[PDB]
Design a protein around this ligand. Structure first.
Ligand SMILES: OC[C@H]1O[C@H](O[C@H]2[C@H](O)[C@@H](O)[C@@H](O)O[C@@H]2CO)[C@H](O)[C@@H](O)[C@@H]1O
Lengths: 371, 403
């Protein structure tokens, strides 16, 4: 049986299992729990045999595809990494370890075939499969051949077969169910009710608009406001000891703000398309260009890598980045417009007693879904 | 309308439009095309109204959430940035401007609401929403109020609404369709016909297996081969000057290799599930962890963004990761077993001439797509299975190695 207070790990005998023992070691050091790394023969065959009885390793390392049957046989626990951790890994890897919508393993490595060419014999490798016969007829003249690879395993021949539209099984990509809208479920009620309770007790005030908030906070007239980076500069100019922290919790759950990516689109009816492409690529989305905008109003965590690695040292950006990981990125589907529209008049009517919280959110559901 | 040889730019009123205007200065100093930076009210409702007529700005600035609606209205042009430029921007910011497969804008910055407070008025910031009633009563006497944010835009009120269960549209994760298998469709028949043609024209030999191609390449007999990271070590000690690049395209489209993702799963019967979680997330899936494994034996490309950026660099890994991203993830569904032995027979029969390309792939197709569940169709699949169940069971001597 699996021993509590200790980690046993299985991994194939052709992997860097000694280096893994090193890692399990630094772990045993800092926490005082031994980590043994083993590599049994036929481990892909042995694991489901013993893990069914309650035995086996705590962690097992194998190619992701074999994990589907493991999860089918109830041998793998569902994996619970936060959004902060999932960002660290590539998104397609998380798809390789999803079975029945649940994450069942941590991806480690990525494997794929490549074209390997002889620099001496072929310093300019071909870019199209079509130009290999011509290259071969030429290379055959010097007693050589252009291409030789394993033809007896479909793992090696599939890249060519799959190029023009072959596939094993069709994978339906991710999407938003525009018929499953959640603006009148229990959680949405508790939130909006709480906000409308904050005005039934005079703690807030209904027609408080954007400018009233900026003025009142930048006059030491209120203890806190909620806003994004663009409004930081005017609080510098107001000389106020402002801090930027994580949003408060509601019912022990963090506030989930919608995350926007400021974006620049080129109009389709513009005759000056290339000049706009030149302005954004070579003047704005540059280290010097983004700084020009950022010193007017703070941009946030920019998309350009170079400049972001500099602004990331700002503790308030890392606070903004922290709050972004607690929230969701916004969809870009056309129905986003009807959602914002509906929720807007829901919050207002509920906030001014024009409609009850329940009735306002109820009307918001239909308007977000059918329009 | 919009006139040629200028740029009209619309950004929102609360952004840094003066600083953006100065970027139009430098654009007009060097490129001297006039740049007018505007900021109308209700900017995102105004843009599709005028751009439908052919009016509006040249460039429009907003959060990504509106651009798909603009795109479905036929108002935005497809963004055509080259590969060199795409690597300067974070890959997930591009995701925000992808719509129906195409990019429709340039990502600029990530925006998120935060709680900002008044240190000299409040020492420690609160942690719960349910405790501001106390802070407010404690404060209304001292002179002022606690919270005051914009209640006219739902963008500001939403973080609280979503906290306990509110959401816009439930994200339904992607999955496979076991009814839709494509081993005998036009694309597969095209690529396989091309492969068999190489054999017919004696550019390749249908008997070539793994060990032949490795020797022929590691001895300078053939210019190229197709292999994985596991085979690099043998090419090293062969003293062949080899490079590893992207796979050749066919019919203008990239070759799609199967992608294998080495993964660490936690035993469902483990009593140490968080110890495993702490070990994998905080110790192994770091730069130091993967490097310790990679130094013992190469992982190839890794799934950790931070350590993969450093690993390639190595052009062999950069190509391995690029071919992977262009390829097909191995499906983890039980039907893959049929695909594996049916396609294997399919390719061999076609390259050897026993079956036409069309007929070989059609045979593997019905083996992987059930569809028909009458006894005639089921016993046919039963019969084909019992023959790909090769009966060895005897000892393999010497055993496949380990040490
Ligand atoms: O409130 C609805 C509104 O929310 C978002 O707009 C944000 C925008 O992302 C920020 O850059 C800043 O301007 O604050 C705005 C809220 O007033 C959505 O982007 C927008 O589509 C939506 O209408």
């Amino acid at each position: 049986k699996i021993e509590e207070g200790k980690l046993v790990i299985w991994i194939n005998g052709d992997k860097g299992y000694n280096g893994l023992a090193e890692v399990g070691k630094k772990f045993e050091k800092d926490t005082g729990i031994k980590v043994t790394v083993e590599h049994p023969d036929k481990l892909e065959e042995k694991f489901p045999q013993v893990a069914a009885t309650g035995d086996g390793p705590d962690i097992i390392f194998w190619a992701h595809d074999r994990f589907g049957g493991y999860a089918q046989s109830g041998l793998l626990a569902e994996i619970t990494p936060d959004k902060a951790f999932q960002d660290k890994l590539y998104p397609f890897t998380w798809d390789a370890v999803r079975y029945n919508g649940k994450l069942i393993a941590y991806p480690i490595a990525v494997e794929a075939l490549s074209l390997i060419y002889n620099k001496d014999l072929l310093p300019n490798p071909p870019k199209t499969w079509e130009e290999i016969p011509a290259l071969d007829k030429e290379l055959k003249a010097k007693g050589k051949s252009a291409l030789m690879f394993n033809l007896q395993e479909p793992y090696f021949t599939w890249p060519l077969i799959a190029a023009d539209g072959g596939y094993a099984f069709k994978y339906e990509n991710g999407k938003y169910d525009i018929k499953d809208v959640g603006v009148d479920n229990a959680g949405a009620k508790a939130g909006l009710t709480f906000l409308v309770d904050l005005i039934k007790n005079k703690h807030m005030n209904a027609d408080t608009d954007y400018s009233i908030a900026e003025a009142a906070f930048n006059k030491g007239e209120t203890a806190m406001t909620i806003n994004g980076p663009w409004a930081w500069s005017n609080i510098d100019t107001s000389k106020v000891n402002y801090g930027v922290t994580v949003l408060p919790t509601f019912k022990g759950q963090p506030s989930k703000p919608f995350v926007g990516v400021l974006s620049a689109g080129i109009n389709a009816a513009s005759p000056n398309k290339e000049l706009a492409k030149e302005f954004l690529e070579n003047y704005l989305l540059t280290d010097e260009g983004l700084e020009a905008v950022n010193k007017d109003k703070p941009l946030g965590a920019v998309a350009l890598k170079s400049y972001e690695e500099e602004l990331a040292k700002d503790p308030r950006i890392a606070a903004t980045m922290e709050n972004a990981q607690k929230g969701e990125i916004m969809p870009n589907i056309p129905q986003m417009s009807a959602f914002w529209y509906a929720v807007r008049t829901a919050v207002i009517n509920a906030a001014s007693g024009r409609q009850t919280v329940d009735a306002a959110l109820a009307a918001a559901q239909t308007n977000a879904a059918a329009k």
